């Protein structure tokens, strides 16, 4: 992916802390170095092919320094609870065709004009209860949406029985009617899902949807059929695929701007962000000034990235290493 | 965006002659030339 | 019908701005009712800082 | 009025555009039949 | 909202958009079933 | 949207301040009554004679 | 198979191809007689 920069952006991966220049022996450490009079902070990191430093951050010229946790950098997949409207009829009307349309809006392109529509259809019969109806439309929606043939993962559809009321039972295009055996199904939940991710070539983006209902004639007046409520999310996409795609850009400030353009002849750089682990991100945003009439500023930023274990053990040791070395009150997160 | 003048004469169609004029009544507020005064300066003189 | 600017969806399909009816001219005013405003001798600015 | 279609005096806004287009032409080197000019 | 133009006297169910007349019943299609008047 | 904003004319103004236009109604009017007094000055209520 | 199309509001009986409607007694022609619906 490609991000916007405030005149530069550089990233350093912090796999461990060594607190001295001579103790840099493994690739991926970081050492926040400074002098006695706290006027310059810089980060000596061990690259896989030698010691590298940072730009020398002037501590009178910092603008902010705030480190975000990994739980605030996760995309929450939306849910939509689709129930029968109790106003029109509590039970399904025995003659009408019951259709539901899922209106996707960023399919293939990025614009809200690149729309995509999928449907689910169940004809309601006589004697069909509400749990028998949701048992039929969870199969009919999953035959479209979660089929084996569709090129992208569109949505995840689950059922909820009224006894459990929290545990989701998954329905897929291969699930038969004999697997769903419950007489208390009361809603259908449509959850977003994670699109595929390719490092530095496919950004993390999702397809949003809206389950829209088609009208059924109930007493001779054609009334909309169902209702859809947004339910608070239970599944998030973690920080692994956003910081591997953030390192990949900000390694180009210190190195090669082209990454594979012409492949007998490339300069490979080794990346240190594992795309299966979550990370914490600290950003010290600073600038530069000459001590003369050139008072026009040049804003910069640095990014430090540390592995997160849930309790932020690696990152709160790093903020505790910057505050005592350089004299900033960076917030312990 | 003034339409392309570098065309063969068969491709200077009827809609192309309207595009040069629909450009004209949009950019007719413009009076800047580097050897002329402003319209409001000459109007003060007249 | 513009789905990028119109974001509230309607219960009967499509954006809710599509269901907006507007009668722009009732009769003939004997002058232009709706026009746009500009300033005489106001070329729009362009200025480089390099 | 300064870009209105009509005028309250009762006149019509006539906008005449003149512009230099670009025409593709050929320069042909032809020989005189009589002399080699 | 739903017009019914014809009335059909028959012992069988004629059509969604007509009225089924039997001996002492007048049944018409509503809510996915034949609803009787009386 | 830009083809909607091209079915409108344009008026060029002389200043970049607030601009006005004057609206008018009619001249002939009807006036509500307050009270009717007879010749001695006492008001004529609903339950009164001619 | 008998298809009635019109409904006549009359105090007396109309032609046999129509429904006799009067004061709350829907009457139609069945089995040779006017048979009330209700």
UniProtKB/Swiss-Prot annotation, chain A:
Gene Ontology, cellular component aspect: viral capsid, decoration
- Tell me the compartments it is located in: Virion
Q: Can the keyword Acetylation be found in this entry's annotation?
A: no
- Region annotation (FD) maps to 75-237
Q: What is known of its domains?
A: The central region FD is structurally similar to Helicobacter pylori flagellar cap protein FliD.
Function text: Auxiliary capsid protein that forms an outer layer on the major capsid protein protrusions.
Q: What is this protein called?
A: Auxiliary capsid protein
Q: Which organism is it from?
A: Bacteroides phage crAss001
Q: What is the lineage of its organism?
A: Viruses, Duplodnaviria, Heunggongvirae, Uroviricota, Caudoviricetes
Curated annotation (Swiss-Prot), chain B:
Which organism was this protein described from? Bacteroides phage crAss001 (Bacteroides phage PhiCrAss001)
Query: Which protein are we looking at?
Result: Portal protein
Q: What does this protein do?
A: Forms the portal vertex of the capsid. Probably involved in head assembly, genome packaging, tail attachment, and genome ejection.
Quaternary assembly = Homododecamer. Interacts with the Cargo protein 1. Interacts with the major capsid protein.
The organism sits in which domain of life?
A: Viruses
Q: Where in the cell is it found?
A: Virion
| Boundaries of the shown chain within the full protein | 6 to 51 of 806
Swiss-Prot record, chain C:
Protein name per Swiss-Prot or TrEMBL: Major capsid protein
According to the record's subunit comment, the protein's assembly and interactions are: Interacts with the auxiliary capsid protein (via FD region). Interacts with the head fiber dimeric protein. Interacts with the head fiber trimeric protein. Interacts with the portal vertex auxiliary protein.
Q: Which organism is it from?
A: Bacteroides phage crAss001
Where is the protein localized? Virion
Q: According to its UniProt entry, what is the function of this protein?
A: Capsid protein self-assembles to form an icosahedral capsid, with a T=9 symmetry, about 77 nm in diameter. Each asymmetric capsid nonamer is covered by 9 capsid auxiliary protein, 1 copy of the trimeric head fiber protein and 2 copies of the dimeric head fiber protein.
Q: What other comment is given for this protein? A: Displays an HK-97-like fold with an insertion domain that protrudes at the capsid surface.
Curated annotation (Swiss-Prot), chains E, G:
Please indicate which superkingdom the organism of origin belongs to: Viruses
Q: Where in the cell is it found?
A: Virion
Purpose of the protein: Forms short fibers at the surface of the viral capsid.
Assembly, per entry: Homotrimer. Interacts with the major capsid protein.
Name of the protein in its database record: Head fiber trimeric protein
Q: What is the originating organism of this protein?
A: Bacteroides phage crAss001
Query: Which lineage ranks, top first, belong to the organism behind this chain?
Result: Viruses, Duplodnaviria, Heunggongvirae, Uroviricota, Caudoviricetes
Parent-protein start and end of this portion: 1 to 38 of 97
């Amino acid at each position: 992916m490609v991000i916007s920069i405030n005149q530069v952006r550089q990233l350093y991966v912090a796999k461990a802390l060594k607190a001295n220049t001579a103790a840099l022996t493994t690739a991926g450490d970081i050492v926040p170095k400074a002098d006695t009079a706290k006027t310059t902070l810089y980060f000596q990191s061990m690259s896989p092919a030698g010691i590298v430093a940072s730009d020398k951050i002037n501590l009178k010229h910092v603008l902010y320094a705030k480190a975000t946790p990994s739980e605030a950098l996760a995309h929450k997949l939306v849910r939509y609870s689709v129930t029968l409207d109790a106003d029109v009829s509590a039970t399904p009307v025995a003659g009408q065709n019951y259709i539901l349309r899922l209106a996707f809006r960023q399919y293939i392109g990025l614009s809200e004009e690149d729309q995509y529509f999928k449907y689910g259809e169940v004809i309601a019969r006589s004697g069909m209860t509400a749990s028998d109806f949701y048992k039929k439309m969870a199969i009919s929606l999953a035959k479209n949406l979660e089929n084996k043939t569709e090129s992208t993962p569109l949505v995840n559809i689950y059922l909820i029985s009224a006894a459990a009321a929290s545990t989701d039972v998954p329905v897929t295009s291969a699930t038969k009617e004999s697997d769903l055996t419950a007489t208390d199904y009361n809603q259908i939940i449509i959850e977003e899902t994670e699109q595929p991710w390719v490092l530095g070539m496919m950004p993390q983006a999702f397809i949003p949807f809206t389950p829209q209902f088609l009208t059924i004639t109930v007493d001779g007046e054609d009334r909309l059929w169902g209702v859809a409520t947004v339910v608070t999310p239970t599944k998030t996409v973690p920080d692994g695929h956003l910081i591997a795609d953030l390192e990949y850009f900000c390694m180009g400030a210190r190195g090669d701007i082209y990454r594979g353009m012409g492949y007998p002849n490339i300069i490979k750089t080794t990346y240190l962000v594992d795309p299966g682990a979550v990370y914490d991100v600290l950003d010290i945003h600073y600038f530069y000034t000459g001590s003369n009439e050139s008072v026009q500023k040049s804003e910069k930023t640095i990014t430090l990235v540390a592995v997160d274990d849930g309790s932020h053990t690696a990152m709160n040791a790093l903020i505790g290493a910057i505050n005592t070395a350089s004299g900033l009150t960076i917030a312990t997160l | 965006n003034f339409p392309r003048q570098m065309l063969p004469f068969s491709k200077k169609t009827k809609q192309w002659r309207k595009d040069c004029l629909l450009w004209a009544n949009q950019k007719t507020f413009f009076n800047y030339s580097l050897v002329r005064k402003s319209v409001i300066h000459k109007k003060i003189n007249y | 019908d513009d789905p990028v600017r119109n974001k509230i969806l309607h219960p009967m399909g499509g954006v809710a701005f599509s269901y907006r009816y507007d009668i722009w001219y009732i009769g003939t005013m004997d002058q232009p009712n709706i026009f746009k405003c500009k300033i005489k001798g106001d070329n729009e600015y362009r200025g480089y800082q390099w | 009025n300064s870009l209105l279609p009509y005028d309250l005096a009762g006149n019509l806004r006539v906008l005449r555009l003149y512009w230099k287009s670009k025409r593709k032409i050929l320069k042909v080197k032809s020989y005189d039949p009589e002399t080699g000019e | 909202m739903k017009t019914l133009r014809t009335l059909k006297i028959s012992p069988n169910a004629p059509d969604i958009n007509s009225v089924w007349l039997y001996k002492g019943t007048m049944k018409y299609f509503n809510n996915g079933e034949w609803e009787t008047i009386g | 949207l830009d083809t909607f904003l091209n079915s409108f004319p344009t008026r060029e103004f002389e200043d970049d301040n607030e601009y006005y236009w004057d609206v008018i109604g009619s001249s002939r009017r009807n006036i509500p009554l307050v009270e009717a007094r007879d010749e001695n000055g006492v008001v004529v209520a609903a339950n009164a004679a001619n």
